[PDB]
């Protein structure tokens, strides 16, 4: 289990305040959303296990998000100052932080990393006590945060409040978060030539998103000719993924797809 | 740790005042509190990065400022008599709790209606009674400070030029010479119990020293009585028999 | 927010428990206790979250629901008379500052061995006009009430400790400027 937060602050010269968008995930389930451009700048829920929370919870979350937007504006100004970038160009500042949770032993691994214009900028090390800078412009932020002890501030949250929030979110939604949705699988056939056809191994409606799909021929792996696509969200919380292979006609019954998912008691081997 | 200034001061109704606080070395966030007599601290405002980041339920008469060196000032004007309190200053690190809150010794502010209300204490030492020496083989000297206002007082016991803390006893809060009076005077008593053999020695010198914080140098005093300046009034005694 | 008893009575050498009620506590809140001596500022004692915490000076008990807390002082002394504050603080950085409650005033007493309550009269060292009455060496349970005469003043109970002789004693002082007031009828 893991809890993660994704912040995106993009600037816009002349238009006004830079847009700030914050999202929160438990594993592959989004539960919170904040947009500074909305006419109602509040922390809005995205899951049934956070709408149960009272008004105080959302009040604290909302004020934190607004102050974070202010801080990210200041950060964008300082960053365009560091890289000597023009005042007319738009720039994106991303943040990703979160905590992992093992079956026992409290937290497993915490992280808090940043990005400027799509590249690594500064990253909190795994010991949660030191930083790593990508270039010289990030060493300025490194020294600024070493003086202010930003690392200990983030460690107090990751090692403490993050784990407690994650465990609470798990307990108050275990019927939709701690279970597993097995993938519904089938194989489709599509001729492309007089003697060649494509077998497509489908996988629909599974949770979480991580799954293993691979075609094998005569029991041995066939990886160099299988065209796989990225895991696509179905829209109702589930995911989708398929893998296709081109085959000479007649030898189709010898090809076999394997599926590996968390919701299966054993990886399933199926043919067409 | 945290340095507040001043320790005590006296003001009049309608005046203004500026209190100062220097945070602990390593902290940068400052928070001001008002503690009235008999109640707990009430939050005023918090200053971080030279800006007001959080504020309680106090009017705009209470303003604040913070300097680049994290030092802070609380400027409160048009003082009402209800503003008499101990003003506390707490320091923290970056609006966090990792480096926990650290409070100062406080600033005792007492705003009064007029300057005639301030009266200095009268100190008197009463020698032990020979009945007590004969019965208990101990001697209890009794100090009494009368007729002081406001309650900006510190009593200490000095034997042979050195301050003593053993056998010393001071009332937790002073009495009122006339209750149901808004500007009533106060009285404070103290006791020092030593050996009878120690008291029966003329070479020992006992002293009750009462320090009173009152008016300062820039204060209009028109009364014919002595000006209630910040002073140190004491009473002396020597060994007997 | 937290609520706690107004006062706690105790004697020297015992274990003192101060209970604090905070039912509407949240996940992102931590518990802390502060101590305020007379004329001083609040001093930190101990903080925690959900497990048992014990330092050099006190112990903190937090149940599973976190809806209450208990501050335990192992062996209280006469130097432990102070006001104790139970606070629930915001755990998030740049959050709400620490808010105090009413507080609990702790009062410790000394079980005196071999008491001998008496009242003496002391004359002034510089003058013969002023004289005071001293009620000394009485029980810790003895209650000295304020005499509502117009110009008769009686102080409160005060406990003094002579370290060299290991001797503790309570005392109260009475006086008046009436010239008719008798010493024997001062603490009755």
């Amino acid at each position: 289990h893991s809890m993660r937060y994704f912040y995106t602050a993009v600037s816009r010269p002349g238009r006004g305040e830079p847009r700030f968008i914050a999202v929160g995930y438990v594993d592959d389930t989004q539960f919170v959303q904040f947009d500074s451009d909305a006419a109602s700048p509040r922390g809005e829920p995205r899951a049934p296990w956070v709408e149960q929370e009272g008004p105080e919870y959302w009040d604290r979350e909302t004020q934190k998000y607004k102050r974070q937007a202010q801080t990210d504006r200041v950060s964008l100004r300082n960053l365009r100052g560091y890289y000597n970038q023009s005042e007319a160009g738009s720039h994106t500042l991303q943040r990703m932080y979160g905590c992992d949770l093992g079956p026992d032993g409290r937290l497993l691994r915490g992280y808090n990393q940043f990005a400027y214009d799509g590249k690594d900028y500064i990253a909190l090390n795994e010991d949660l006590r030191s930083w790593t800078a990508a270039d010289k412009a990030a060493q300025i932020t490194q020294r600024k945060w070493e003086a202010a002890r930003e690392a200990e501030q983030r460690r107090a949250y990751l090692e403490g409040t993050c784990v407690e929030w994650l465990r609470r979110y798990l307990e108050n939604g275990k019927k939709t978060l701690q279970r597993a949705e097995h993938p519904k699988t089938h194989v489709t056939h599509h001729p492309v030539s007089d003697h060649e056809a494509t077998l497509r191994c489908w996988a629909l409606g599974f949770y979480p998103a991580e799954i293993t799909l691979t075609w094998q021929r005569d029991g041995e792996d066939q990886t160099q000719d299988t065209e796989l696509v990225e895991t696509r969200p179905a829209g109702d919380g589930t995911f989708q993924k398929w893998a296709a292979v081109v085959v000479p006609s007649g030898e189709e019954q010898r090809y076999t797809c394997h599926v590996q998912h968390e919701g299966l008691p054993e990886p399933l081997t199926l043919r067409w | 740790g945290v340095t507040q200034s001043p320790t005590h001061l006296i003001k009049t109704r309608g005046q203004q005042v500026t209190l100062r606080c220097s945070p602990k070395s390593g902290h940068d966030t400052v928070s001001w509190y008002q503690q009235a007599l008999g109640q707990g601290p009430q939050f005023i405002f918090q200053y971080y990065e030279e800006e007001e980041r959080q504020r309680g339920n106090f009017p705009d008469r209470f303003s604040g400022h913070q300097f680049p060196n994290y030092s802070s000032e609380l400027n409160v004007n048009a003082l009402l008599l209800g503003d008499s309190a101990l003003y506390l200053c707490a320091s923290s690190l970056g609006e966090g709790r990792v480096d926990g809150y650290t409070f100062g010794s406080g600033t005792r502010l007492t705003v009064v209606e007029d300057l005639r209300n301030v009266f200095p204490p009268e100190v008197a030492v009463f020698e032990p009674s020979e009945a007590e020496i004969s019965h208990t083989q101990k001697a209890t000297l009794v100090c009494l400070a009368t007729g002081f206002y406001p309650d900006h007082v510190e009593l200490s016991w000095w034997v042979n030029g050195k301050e003593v803390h053993s056998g010393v006893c001071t009332d937790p809060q002073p009495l009122k010479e006339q209750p149901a009076l808004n500007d009533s005077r106060y009285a404070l008593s103290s006791r020092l119990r030593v050996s009878a053999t120690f008291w029966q020695n003329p070479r020992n010198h006992f002293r009750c020293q009462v320090q009173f914080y009152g008016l300062s140098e820039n204060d209009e005093w028109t009364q014919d009585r002595a000006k209630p300046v910040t002073q140190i009034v004491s009473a002396e005694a020597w060994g007997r028999a | 927010k937290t609520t706690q008893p107004i006062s706690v009575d105790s004697y020297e050498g015992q274990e003192v428990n101060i209970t604090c009620s905070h039912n509407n506590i949240a996940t992102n809140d931590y518990i802390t206790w502060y101590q305020q001596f007379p004329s001083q500022g609040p001093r930190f004692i101990i903080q925690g979250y959900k497990t048992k915490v014990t330092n050099e000076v006190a112990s903190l008990f937090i149940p599973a629901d976190r809806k209450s807390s208990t501050l335990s002082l192992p062996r209280v002394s006469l130097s432990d008379t102070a006001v104790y504050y139970c606070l629930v603080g915001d755990m998030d950085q740049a959050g709400t500052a620490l808010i105090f409650g009413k507080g609990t005033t702790l009062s410790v007493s000394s079980d005196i061995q071999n008491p001998d309550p008496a009242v003496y009269q002391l004359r002034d060292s510089k003058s013969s006009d002023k004289s005071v009455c001293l009620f000394t060496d009485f029980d810790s349970q003895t209650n000295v009430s304020q005499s509502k005469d117009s110009d008769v003043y009686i102080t409160d109970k005060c406990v003094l400790d002579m370290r060299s002789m290991d001797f503790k004693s309570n005392s109260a002082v009475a006086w008046s400027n009436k010239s008719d007031f008798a010493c024997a009828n001062a603490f009755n």
Partner: peptide
Amino acid sequence: GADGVGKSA
């Protein structure tokens, strides 16, 4: 629960 805001970049 989201983390609090810290020192600016």
